[PDB]
């Protein structure tokens, strides 16, 4: 059985297992954390000798103390396997090593643990002696990995090595100190020297074995893949049946999908067709197309990018908390999910995606407020352009079908008057003259009188009123009616509001862009009504939108920031604060009212303020009208030290008599009368409620069915009419869809009142901040795993057996199916359209559902082991790693790009291959924006730093999404703008570590990574005083080497040729040279060899890499990836400190001193290339760059070669050439046959937009296109492809160049010299 084994190890040592289990066990719950910290401080976990025993002990403890149930325990095992907590612990260590140790005064011997109080270190719990005054920045800032126990004026921090017994007494000193309330307690970690410096073995990634020869196409134990004629069509269909027939189908799919290329000809055997599933063709015809992969998690639709083990563990965790909340009202997990993803519920989300409009009309203000800028039927511009509705309906494309302040008050009077008697043009005239001549809003009669004198065009109708305005009706009615319009729709303030077809669009940045989007969306909405005959010939088009429009607009109910929405769990509120909610004044909703009428309202208000008590009167008024509402009042006062229980006690006595207040003073007087004893138990539950609900003191809030609006600054903002619309809108979206769906399932017996109903509606709203597949028959295409009756998690997978994406999905889903309380149901849907081979690779996923232990009890390493490997097939090893990870090969003796078992058996003697990779870096990536006119600042330079070193890394901001990235490991970092033009123009207020926001408390520039998902940021940069400047326009040798050359090689041969290339440079120059390599495409054999090349030849080297952005279009073929790396990331791949770089292609040899290329002036161009040889006389026919596409495009410009080129990096960055290359590539890449060789084709396609300096032809020689006479004056040779010959590259080198062997001999003896340095 010939096998292949691949493993991955992290760039940091494995933290002690004990501390890892503490962190994994208490994911984010602090009570579990310190409750377990007590247990290990007893010395309770000291008797467990091995990792297995230690793990075993935690299971009994968590179960016994009530921390976890079976479902949460199973989730703990999987998260523990994933080693999710390891980077979180390493964050503590990096912080401790880089900021604590260099800032700590005093000798450290005996000070294993020590509290830090007021910049003083105490090595003893008794606090007798202080060793030092700690230097550096403030350590008391609360950062992401911190935990706090208790509230205290003083802040105490304990840096402990938990492993030893010396920890226990220190802990108890501050645990009790926090329990009393003297100070707040928090624990930080210290690197424990008891543990070894062994690296960490990781999992949650995939390995692929790609077939590199796919040209072929016209039982167990196979030698090679046999290719067949165009009978591919049945592969998916027959493959799907095989599984159904097996009767252990889950295992069959995994076994088939992992080694699929090998089983191709093995399919179609033993009466294979068996189309019993002929009824399920209707399944594919009604909902999803054939061959498509779709996954659902309790209705939630997931794409491939969202399917990572780390991200999926967090989804289950969030989902269980949500469902447990539901099943406290007697609902099964099955009933609960069914209600959440019900059709009537999903319809409401789509319904509220469709915007609601507001009545912008003059009708209320008697038509004397808004000035109609244009008129389509009476303007004499559009008049004759067909006045028909069918002109609008019969349309396609993007064409147009046709048919506050004092000065403002005065100028409104002026314009209004001037319009009324004289007309629009005369009013227009005043405005235009005022703009140029006076240039201010202030009323000018010197300018006004001139307008009456010139534009006095027959003022008909009502007579003129002359020069001065103070009209009792004109000034009063018109101006105050205008104010009533602005107020009604909240169209003023700091940010005014524009209304397009009754849709509010705030006057900010690119509102026209938003307007255009709705303009097209409204047009398509009209067309569909017209085709169905909904519309008629005599109709006003704007009134179709005004059908459901509301007259008044409340910014609280309908915020312009559509994200702004907050809902609380109602069930939680009445069990957490039962002491409070059983003593609040409650007006029960009438029992003799209907379920549809039912709703639950709670008003939180400061009754010691006029606004707070005004708001309650309106709520009481609203309750008289609506018999179905159940009201609560509570009382939240701003003033502290005065008991809130007294005013609540005043009202609960009058509770029976509530809403019998003929006038407002009756409520005012009820608050003042009565003598009461403060229930201090009530006061305690009251302040706990506000803390849980994140509410401040003296702030007014309104809660209907869990949804909260507030804080209410003025009670005039929320009136009786505002409660009615709030109930109307809320009712529609959340209450009505819950009621229908609930009744359809037959759960409408569980609703016993308004409070009972609110629990359900409030929970379903929290779920989003579909069950369309239940229509499908399941008998012949589906299979289930896990108990549906007990399961809380329901997975629905729709996998196509012939897909490569399916390979990953099955492997991950099998491990998640092993969890207790999870149900999985699978659908197989293949395609009949198979033009090429469906799966061209073997796949294995490294993941375990529970930790694995050694024979010695240690934690087992996790690996991808392939056991069904064909001996004669050429394979490529690839890593399918989570997006935040950067991975390279570290240990391998064979060529991972060219694997063959028969050659390894004939050279090494073994049919078993082992390779190890390294998770070298984890990404810090973000999306930047300018402030306040938010756009991507391109060309901006950034620096990442740490307290130890102020220059960890550097990158530049991209145009697309303001993208940037850094390569880093767990720890505390900071982002500063690079010294120069960047800091001159900008200042960055924040790095968006909390979200898009701004969330309060995020005015920070600190970044920390404590997860395998890296760190996602949304930084903000605001321009410095009065700047419209750009980093482009006016207001390396010492660091690296004389010459900087970069290259890339794929195979052992290309790496061997790369060794020759570097040597030829060295022999041919008495200068300093530095070599740069694209790190991830090189072999470990080459990687381990270079220091020996560097010692012999006297050069410097540096490994560089960049991770292919998620937005940027991928390359499925690795050779295409390599080409992209040479052209797409030139500006970001190399550090800012380097002035220029030169690319030389691996199969090249150089006879010249390479400095000359540096000194060559590039005539203000960012990069320079050499053209194709014309010298060969008889080669012409195969010169394709003088034909059709290339000759039409390159009218006079040359066809350049990407074998050798210069990049003036400083100018490249300055010109921002990279951004243009990237977006043109992405745009061109939609067509698959777009770039044959992108590396050559992209600079050639961009040479008119981006200048290309052309090089002397002395710089390149190739036998194929240059004459033999030419080689005497040749500087460098590429070894250009045949193309009509058969001689290989090894042959050309020895025949074409005689000194090639001399270079090869030097490397050969050195390799042997190195080989004898191991026994
Ligand atoms: C962080 O992790 C910890 C640990 O898991 C969680 O903290 C603790 O969780 C446990 C549950 O695992 C809590 O105790 C349980 O409480 C339930 C509920 O019953 C009643 O008791 C509550 C107080 O314990 C109280 O809030 C409610 O009481 C009502 O009635 C009183 C009447 O006087 C009234 O005053 C209140 O206002 C309430 O109206 C509540 O109804 C209880 O059922 C549990 O008993 C279990 O016992 C065994 C297991 O030992 C089991 O066999 C039984 O079936 C039963 O289920 C248990 O007492 C504990 O109070 C929590 N402590 C803290 C500090 O939180 C924490 O919730 C996690 N947080 C997060 C975010 O995950
Ligand atoms: C730039 C320069 O002068 N380089 C010289 C080279 O020409 C000479 O062949 C070699 C051996 O003497 O020493 C060095
Ligand atoms: C489900 O199966 C029945 C026969 O049992 C068939 O009539 C029906 O059309 C099928 N539905 C779909 C969507 O294929
Ligand atoms: Ca070459």
Author numbering: 28 to 245, 277 to 461, 506 to 871, 887 to 1152, 1193 to 1476
Quote the study on this structure.
Central to ERQC is the ER-resident 170-kDa enzyme UDP-glucose:glycoprotein glucosyltransferase (UGGT). The enzyme selectively reglucosylates a misfolded glycoprotein on one of its N-glycans and promotes its association with the ER lectins calnexin and calreticulin, thus mediating its ER retention. The full-length Chaetomium thermophilum UGGT (CtUGGT) crystal structures revealed four DsbA-like domains (TRXL1–4) arranged in a long arc, terminating in two β sandwiches (βS1 and βS2) tightly clasping the glucosyltransferase family 24 (GT24) domain (Roversi et al., 2017). Overall, UGGT's motions can be described in simple terms as two rigid groups of domains moving with respect to one another.
The resolution of the CtUGGTKif crystal structure is nevertheless sufficient to reveal that the molecule adopts a so far unobserved conformation, which we label “new-intermediate. The CtUGGTkif “new-intermediate” conformation combines a TRXL1-TRXL3 distance as found in the “open” conformation and a TRXL2/TRXL3 relative orientation similar to the one found in the “closed-like” conformation. The TRXL1:TRXL3 domain clamp is open in the “new-intermediate” CtUGGTKif structure (CC1 = 43.2 Å). In the same structure, the TRXL2:TRXL3 domain pair twist adopts a middle-of-the-range value (CC3 = 3.2°). In addition to the three regions that are usually disordered in CtUGGT crystal structures (namely the TRXL4 loop, residues 246–276; the flexible linker between BS2 and the GT24 domain, residues 1,153–1,192; and the residues between the last helix and the ER retrieval motif at the C terminus, residues 1,474–1,510), this structure has disordered regions in the center of the TRXL2 domain (missing residues 461–505); and at the boundary between TRXL3 and TRXL4 (missing residues 862–886). Overall the thermal motion is rather high (= 270 Å2). This is likely due to loose crystal packing. Alternatively, kifunensine has inhibited ERAD mannosidases and our crystal may have grown from a mixture of molecules bearing minor folding defects: the high B factors in this case would be modeling static disorder. PC2 describes a movement in which the TRXL2 domain rotates with respect to TRXL3, with the βS2, TRXL1, and TRXL4 domains also undergoing motion. The motion encoded by PC2 is well represented in the MD starting from the “new-intermediate” CtUGGTKif structure, whose projection in Figure 3D also shows a considerable degree of back-and-forth movement. In particular, the MD simulations starting from the “open,” “intermediate,” and “new-intermediate” CtUGGTKif structures reach conformations with extreme PC values.
